[PDB]
Amino acid sequence: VPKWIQLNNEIMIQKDGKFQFDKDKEAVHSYFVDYINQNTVFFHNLKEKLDYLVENQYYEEEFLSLYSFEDIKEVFKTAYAKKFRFPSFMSAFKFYNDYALKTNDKKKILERYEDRISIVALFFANGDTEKAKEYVNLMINQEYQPSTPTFLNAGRKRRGELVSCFLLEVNDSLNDISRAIDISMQLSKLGGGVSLNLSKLRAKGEAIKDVENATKGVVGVMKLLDNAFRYADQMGQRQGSGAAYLNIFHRDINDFLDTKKISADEDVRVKTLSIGVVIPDKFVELAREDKAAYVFYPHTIYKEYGQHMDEMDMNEMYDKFVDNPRVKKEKINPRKLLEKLAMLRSESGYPYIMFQDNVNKVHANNHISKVKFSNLCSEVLQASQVSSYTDYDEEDEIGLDISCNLGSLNILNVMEHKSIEKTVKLATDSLTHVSETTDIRNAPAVRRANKAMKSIGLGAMNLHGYLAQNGIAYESPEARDFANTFFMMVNFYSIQRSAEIAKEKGETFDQYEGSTYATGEYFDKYVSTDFSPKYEKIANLFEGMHIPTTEDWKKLKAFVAEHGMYHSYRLCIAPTGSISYVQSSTASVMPIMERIEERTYGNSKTYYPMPGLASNNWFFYKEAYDMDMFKVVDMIATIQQHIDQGISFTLFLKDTMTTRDLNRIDLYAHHRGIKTIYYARTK
Amino acid sequence: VPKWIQLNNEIMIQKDGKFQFDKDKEAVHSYFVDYINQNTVFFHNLKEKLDYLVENQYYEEEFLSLYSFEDIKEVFKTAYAKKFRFPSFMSAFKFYNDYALKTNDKKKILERYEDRISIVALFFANGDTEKAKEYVNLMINQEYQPSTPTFLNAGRKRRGELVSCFLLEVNDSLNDISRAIDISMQLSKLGGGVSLNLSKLRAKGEAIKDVENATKGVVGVMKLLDNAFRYADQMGQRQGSGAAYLNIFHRDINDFLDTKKISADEDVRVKTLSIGVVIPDKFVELAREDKAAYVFYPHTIYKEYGQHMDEMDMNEMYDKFVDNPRVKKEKINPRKLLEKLAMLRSESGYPYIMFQDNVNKVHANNHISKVKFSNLCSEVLQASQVSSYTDYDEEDEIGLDISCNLGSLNILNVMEHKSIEKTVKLATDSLTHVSETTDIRNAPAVRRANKAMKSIGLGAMNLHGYLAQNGIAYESPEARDFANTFFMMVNFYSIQRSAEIAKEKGETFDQYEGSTYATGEYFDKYVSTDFSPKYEKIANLFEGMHIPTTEDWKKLKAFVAEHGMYHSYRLCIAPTGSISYVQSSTASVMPIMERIEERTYGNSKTYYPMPGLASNNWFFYKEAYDMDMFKVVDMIATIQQHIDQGISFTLFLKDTMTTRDLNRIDLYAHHRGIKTIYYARTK
Amino acid sequence: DFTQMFYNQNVKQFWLPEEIALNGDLLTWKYLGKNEQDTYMKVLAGLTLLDTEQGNTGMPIVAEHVDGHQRKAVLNFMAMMENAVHAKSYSNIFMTLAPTETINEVFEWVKQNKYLQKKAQMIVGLYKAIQKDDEISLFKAMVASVYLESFLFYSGFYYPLYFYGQGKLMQSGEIINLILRDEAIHGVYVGLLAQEIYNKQTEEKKAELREFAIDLLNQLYENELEYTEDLYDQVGLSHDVKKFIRYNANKALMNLGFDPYFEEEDINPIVLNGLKATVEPLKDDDFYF
Amino acid sequence: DFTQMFYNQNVKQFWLPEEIALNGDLLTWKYLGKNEQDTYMKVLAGLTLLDTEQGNTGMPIVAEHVDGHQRKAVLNFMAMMENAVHAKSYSNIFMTLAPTETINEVFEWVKQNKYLQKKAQMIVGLYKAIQKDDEISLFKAMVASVYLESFLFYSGFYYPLYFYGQGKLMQSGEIINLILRDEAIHGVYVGLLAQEIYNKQTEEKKAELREFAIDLLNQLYENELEYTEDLYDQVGLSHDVKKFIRYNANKALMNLGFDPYFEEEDINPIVLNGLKATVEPLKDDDFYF
Numbered sequence A, B: 001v002p003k004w005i006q007l008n009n010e011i012m013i014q015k016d017g018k019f020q021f022d023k024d025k026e027a028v029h030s031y032f033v034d035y036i037n038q039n040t041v042f043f044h045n046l047k048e049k050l051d052y053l054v055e056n057q058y059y060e061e062e063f064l065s066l067y068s069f070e071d072i073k074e075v076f077k078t079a080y081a082k083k084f085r086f087p088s089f090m091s092a093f094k095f096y097n098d099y100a101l102k103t104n105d106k107k108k109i110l111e112r113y114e115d116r117i118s119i120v121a122l123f124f125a126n127g128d129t130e131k132a133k134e135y136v137n138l139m140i141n142q143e144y145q146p147s148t149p150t151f152l153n154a155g156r157k158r159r160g161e162l163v164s165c166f167l168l169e170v171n172d173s174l175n176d177i178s179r180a181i182d183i184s185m186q187l188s189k190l191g192g193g194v195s196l197n198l199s200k201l202r203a204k205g206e207a208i209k210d211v212e213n214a215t216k217g218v219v220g221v222m223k224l225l226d227n228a229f230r231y232a233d234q235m236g237q238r239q240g241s242g243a244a245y246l247n248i249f250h251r252d253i254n255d256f257l258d259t260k261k262i263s264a265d266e267d268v269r270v271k272t273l274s275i276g277v278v279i280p281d282k283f284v285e286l287a288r289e290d291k292a293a294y295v296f297y298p299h300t301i302y303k304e305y306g307q308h309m310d311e312m313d314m315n316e317m318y319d320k321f322v323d324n325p326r327v328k329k330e331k332i333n334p335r336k337l338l339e340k341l342a343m344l345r346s347e348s349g350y351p352y353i354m355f356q357d358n359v360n361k362v363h364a365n366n367h368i369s370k371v372k373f374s375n376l377c378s379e380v381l382q383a384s385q386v387s388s389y390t391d392y393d394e395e396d397e398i399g400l401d402i403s404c405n406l407g408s409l410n411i412l413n414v415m416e417h418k419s420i421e422k423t424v425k426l427a428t429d430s431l432t433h434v435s436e437t438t439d440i441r442n443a444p445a446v447r448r449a450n451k452a453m454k455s456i457g458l459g460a461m462n463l464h465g466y467l468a469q470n471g472i473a474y475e476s477p478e479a480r481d482f483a484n485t486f487f488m489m490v491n492f493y494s495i496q497r498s499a500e501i502a503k504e505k506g507e508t509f510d511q512y513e514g515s516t517y518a519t520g521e522y523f524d525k526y527v528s529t530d531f532s533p534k535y536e537k538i539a540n541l542f543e544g545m546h547i548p549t550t551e552d553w554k555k556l557k558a559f560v561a562e563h564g565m566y567h568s569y570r571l572c573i574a575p576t577g578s579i580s581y582v583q584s585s586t587a588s589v590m591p592i593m594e595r596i597e598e599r600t601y602g603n604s605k606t607y608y609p610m611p612g613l614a615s616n617n618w619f620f621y622k623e624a625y626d627m628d629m630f631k632v633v634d635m636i637a638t639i640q641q642h643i644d645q646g647i648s649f650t651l652f653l654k655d656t657m658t659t660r661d662l663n664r665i666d667l668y669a670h671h672r673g674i675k676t677i678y679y680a681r682t683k
Numbered sequence C, D: 001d002f003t004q005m006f007y008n009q010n011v012k013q014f015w016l017p018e019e020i021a022l023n024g025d026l027l028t029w030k031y032l033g034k035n036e037q038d039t040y041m042k043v044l045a046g047l048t049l050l051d052t053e054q055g056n057t058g059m060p061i062v063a064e065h066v067d068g069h070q071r072k073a074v075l076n077f078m079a080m081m082e083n084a085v086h087a088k089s090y091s092n093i094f095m096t097l098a099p100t101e102t103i104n105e106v107f108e109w110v111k112q113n114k115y116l117q118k119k120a121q122m123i124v125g126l127y128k129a130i131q132k133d134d135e136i137s138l139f140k141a142m143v144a145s146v147y148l149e150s151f152l153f154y155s156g157f158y159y160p161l162y163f164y165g166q167g168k169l170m171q172s173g174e175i176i177n178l179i180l181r182d183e184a185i186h187g188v189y190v191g192l193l194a195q196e197i198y199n200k201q202t203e204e205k206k207a208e209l210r211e212f213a214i215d216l217l218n219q220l221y222e223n224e225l226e227y228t229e230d231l232y233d234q235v236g237l238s239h240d241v242k243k244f245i246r247y248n249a250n251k252a253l254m255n256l257g258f259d260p261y262f263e264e265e266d267i268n269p270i271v272l273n274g275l276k277a278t279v280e281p282l283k284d285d286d287f288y289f
């Protein structure tokens, strides 16, 4: 047995009635001095290391050529001056197993944490030495963490894309379905997760050029996409991951949900394709009144009105669709559909739930389009325009397919350094650079929307870690007060950085003038309501850091109106799965699942205590399953009001609660303004 | 029970020790008088019928506008002047159930046999009244039958494509694989069977741009294509049919064959994708000498030589592949692979066997490309060039994808009319017209090859019917003598008509100058060997008809050298599945499976004696299973020497025959020059 | 050619009564009229009584006389499903919908009922007449068994399927659908065993066995018509039930390798909504001609 | 007082050999000596024979003669396990570990092995001697069945358990443990039915029944000794196995309500080491907060 995992297993050996948490420091120390320093390739000087990495196709020469080697040396000194030490064995293990650069035979280790951070910083700065040093300070302090694609591939030659979330709109045509399959395989080949909207596709039993009952529905396209994602699996190390989204008023909604039932046949069930359901407020209203709802055939609506069903307002056109004789509709029970959704989430965790009117009542770019679906992680909520892929000889009408670059602030380290403003602005700059350097040459709509919208996603993690290490319960009102103030400040500084970038570059995102930022309606609650902490305990947490007031928000609103905004979307809180270990942080803003996390890697068993877990804060690290989901919904809704995109909201359910409890949680989330619900995890 | 169904069922009732074959005339008469004349929409004049058909979106006004109504009336007069009578109930039933035009609700009948033939002839002539009358005489005499797509769809507004066989080359790239899936779905949407060459795709466990062992091989593409064909199910009317071809020296050949095993896993098995194996002479030579053979990874060969493995001659390059250390290969037993092929064909009828060197040793367009694979019916053998479908922004390199137009001579009716020359030339003209009027907007390589090659397929049928009705056994040497003479005449007159069309239009097919027609090497066996019948009985069958001699072939060779050749390919003998009933003919050049055909339509069972079956010729209608497959191979090889493309050669096997017997039949077919083997049908 | 395949299909269809919660049926049961509740009870008791004969006698007697270890195992599995799964499932449905005294009375009534008794005793009579080492008597019993599995149950199954297709009594309807799915495969399997015996007979003996099968079908069918009117006239469904009986009679005949007896009819849409030759190596000289 | 709990236990123990992947045993099997593999194959073949007859004959015949639908359901379920699950599992093991010729040879070996034929003759003879309504013939067959369940299997079970306990052939061993878990409850259940019949007798009759049981046990025991030596001498384990079968003979006697007959001995310690979410409808008040 390895010495470091033997030391790491001494955490669970209870001495004097307490877990031996200090063993993990010894575990990581042994891990380093027995595996990492031995397996690390060491060079005489940094020049030899950089030459070796560039020559043997490990790095990219173009980005390293913008700095003189003295500047690169200064950046590397800045990284190593911090003398960063991983606080736990899991942090270092995850870094050196997932993100650290290794030789071509996966034998030795080329990059340390400082080397990877310096390379990512030099990639971000794009020739600026001082900016590279600022990025080095930001990441070595672990105040900001670039997403797994960016952190893993920044500055590497044989790399995937820096963006891994893509959202595709599929038009109701065979040419568009073929192009969707092709683009899904191309983006899965790049390593990205692809989400597809299947609402515009006509339902099963619709006509294809005046021959009736000809269309196979969205389930045939679902099978096509599932096999396309199985094919594009990247060696199978990380198999192709796709998501399909359907509006709840689509006629194929029941067959769409039946693809996830355990008793589904092999000719229907999809395995590699996640599913999400978009629920307008009309459906919730119909279920609330116990009235008879109707699902509609999309092609009939398109023929009658000239627009797709999901491109229309259901809360204003549902009655017109029902009364229209030329529109084909099927009678359903909305409460039965809700119960089926709850049962499916209990048994499989699917579908993702998107509350469409919750997304679009605060959506800043409804003039471009309404948000019709989310991503595979169920947190990207941006306007999309469907493309019109025509025959081979004809030109294609390219729409807007969503993609944003992810990045997470570490709430604990940002709050410790009292650097919300600087971290948010530097992270915004880095995400802007990642957006500018991303060029997808096989997804035309993704390319066009990346160039036009310039959308970024700046998330946060370690919310529960910060609260538990500060003696604040996750369900407590003080926690929600802190989240309100913190994320209002993050929104303020992200908007300020976006406006400053627009002023410097002299350009805004496409169709900015129709957005709520341009009209000033976005800033109404910020110029009217003060978001300063209401509790003295929380107010001391922000001591030494300026909290923008209503006057500051009015000044920012004037600044945005006079200079514009560079990013259509700025903030989205992703799950942040594996980078949370490296940053020694709790995953996303969701509460922790286990206080001490037990994992098996190969034939070795190792345990990961939550960051900062001890006996003085053992009960503040309350597990997500033991807490009220209503209070978690309250917390996420408090955070969501400052996030322009969505939050990957996982529901943590006990075995005792029924499907009615899950439905109640979903309805309370819809009532409280939750935009999306990610997973129904059951213990 | 219908009266005609009862009358047709009285055939099996044996009266005086003989079947009541005359009951089928009563059966068809009752069928007509009781159902067809009742359900046939009648109009006061032909003008009213034509106006109703064009204005109700049944016909195309474009082709009918090319004639004055007087010309159309005279064409219809010519069709009805013959007073054509269906000899059997099954002929009329098949026509009025598959090809006759029905109302939009499929309740009444708009088109009689004469109406359908007149419309097809008017579409063929393209404005010529005398040509339309000639086509009417050719088809109402049932000397020439246009293929099911052409006969069914010609002159129809809501029609599918007139071509139903397509052959696509798939390049070793994700872009090309996605484009192949798209084109397969587009062509299956049109109702055409699609054949895909998978030999260029790199095998399983190959490197994808420095990531070794990352390719799923040809089986992942096979699953993608199977789901693509299942989705593109011809508007839910007829199941989507596709074929995949792999070279026997491809590394994935065993995985390719395992997709058809009865015990195949659901993640390997393909349901709607037929498979064909391409076998060069090198494999047969290795199996003959029992030397252990090698299957090669195609991408290693492409990297080493810059050419695809299937683009190179295996006979000369096999030793270089084996001796090359940079070419990856695995040892196989060629005899074990042959036994596996025979076992698979016994179990499921798959794969098709294409003898690569048998095709290419007589191929007239080897300069353009070698024939690498066949169609879904295993008779189309044409040169193909793979397309290089690049990224979306880049320009694609369009190659040549095979698609030929099918037509069948009725050997009995052509022979009784002594009109081999006239029928062959008119059929060539009609197939040329179908080729010119075909434009496919979503298969650029298919469209380019249709425009450039101008290839047609003129088949034959009713060989066994003609022989049995003339007192000639199918396995007899006299039958092979007749086939030799008849198909030599067919080839002569097809070449003459093609050269005449080239002279009239002043243009040949693309890259004709490199063909064996241009160099005269094609005509060597025709200017050196006499193909007149060697039997007095057979020579009497051709009385009143000039059989081309050696001097006639020399004159044709000079004419082709002077004026060129319009069609790269002219003759291919398709199975002719359903049009054989309408023509009262035996299917293709194959012998009859059963003397009397027992089939069930709806809840009523039907009986179909073979055309011309009686007491005198009962034993000349020997069933195919009772026949010696070696003699059938001899017959098909006699025909194959005059057919430039292949022949759909079905093996009719008994249950008692072994795997060794099927292998012996395949090896004798290879020895005798058989190009393709279609099906292994076991009784 | 078929026993291992049926083994697989049988064991993968395994289920238990406890899997379906029955109590939620009381929310639609309370809204049915007296005639509907009466018909349902009587139909249910009919199915229960017939299925008990199949579990105690029909399947075990066939398993006893059939030769072959693998066939005996499949037949044992089917007998187990009758006795351990189906019988408990019918009891569970009854106990949920009726009080103990009502159950006892319905079974007393159906036990005395002329049309139920006629068919039950006709089938049991053929099982009792099987003689050791006599394949003709075994075949006759197999025909009786197929007629029960694939035909006689269906005048009964109609009603639960009719409710199930309307959204009524969904829990018990789900149970009935699982039972019916088992009886379908039982009928097909026993049918193949009967065809095996039939195919070993002379042409004269075959014609005689066909006459037996058709004569038996006729007797059972005429009694089914009376059984049907007796139960379904009070709820106005007999015409449609009769179509369903004939359709299932045709399936039973096809299971026995015989032609359909009745003309094809459409079925009530509500009920529809409820519903290697020989490997030989190449030994050289086969490549030379 | 017991059938319902046995019914529940039997159905909750339901399993199929396909649930256990066997390719993991491939290497530990390859590594055994030829003597060890031979004994192992033969041991499992002897078990297969016993389960074949217990499933085809023993359990169905006892089911036929025992009164009560629930008792019959338990016995029918046990019968299914014998031939549809247990006997078949051995073929799964054989098909994984052995080539077809070795499999063919071992089944030929069961047919000609005199000890295996003798034990089958004796046990099946008693099953086929049961007379309707004759409780004494039934008791005798139930004693035979308990001796098969709780004694005779154990000369076979020893070897898979012996390997399992050393960490060898653990997937096959997992199957065998599941089979053994079933037979233990089968032996107890049949034992309780036998005791019911025994307890109805006069003291004089009881004395004769004990004589029958002990004479039968001794006769089976003497044959099993010779069988054990024949199989285990080549692997050096005959004396150890003999101690194990005596241990289990005492358990069989106890299942029949009789005192242990053999003295206690130390058994090889290796062999000892070898041993949806609830659906609740939404209320109107659930939509307001």
Ligand SMILES: Cc1cn([C@H]2C[C@H](O)[C@@H](COP(=O)(O)OP(=O)(O)OP(=O)(O)O)O2)c(=O)[nH]c1=O
Pocket: A171, A172, A173, A174, A175, A177, A201, A202, A207, A208, A209, A210, A214, A215, A216, A217, A220, B189, B231, B232, B233, B234, B235
């Ligand atoms: C061709 C084809 C289409 N479809 C469905 C999927 C598409 O969403 C939908 C549109 O097909 P289209 O490609 O748009 O077919 P079309 O343009 O000829 O028909 P229309 O005039 O009505 O637009 O039909 C199938 O389900 N199966 C098929 O084979």
Ligand SMILES: Nc1nc2c(ncn2[C@H]2C[C@H](O)[C@@H](COP(=O)(O)OP(=O)(O)O)O2)c(=O)[nH]1
Pocket: A041, A042, A043, A044, A045, A046, A047, A049, A073, A076, A077, A078, A080, A081, A115
């Ligand atoms: N020598 C050396 N330095 C490395 C390597 N990887 C990262 N570094 C960092 C450590 C220092 O902060 C920086 C400069 O190291 P160096 O080139 O040895 O310079 P110096 O120590 O002579 O100033 O580069 C490495 O492999 N070798």
Ligand SMILES: Nc1nc2c(ncn2[C@H]2C[C@H](O)[C@@H](COP(=O)(O)OP(=O)(O)O)O2)c(=O)[nH]1
Pocket: B041, B042, B043, B044, B045, B046, B047, B049, B073, B076, B077, B078, B080, B115
């Ligand atoms: N009248 C009529 N003729 C039909 C129809 N379908 C095909 N025909 C053919 C029959 C004749 O050969 C031809 C002309 O028919 P017509 O218009 O009645 O001609 P005429 O005999 O009055 O000059 O059209 C049809 O529906 N009606």
Ligand SMILES: [Mg+2]
Pocket: A172, A173, A174
């Ligand atoms: Mg369209």
Ligand SMILES: [Mg+2]
Pocket: B172, B173, B174
């Ligand atoms: Mg490539």
Ligand SMILES: [Mn+2]
Pocket: C051, C054, C081, C082, C086, C179, C183
């Ligand atoms: Mn039953």
Ligand SMILES: [Mn+2]
Pocket: C054, C082, C149, C182, C183, C186
């Ligand atoms: Mn049954």
Ligand SMILES: [Mn+2]
Pocket: D051, D054, D081, D082, D086, D087, D179, D182, D183
């Ligand atoms: Mn057993």
Ligand SMILES: [Mn+2]
Pocket: D054, D078, D082, D149, D182, D183, D186, D187
């Ligand atoms: Mn047992």
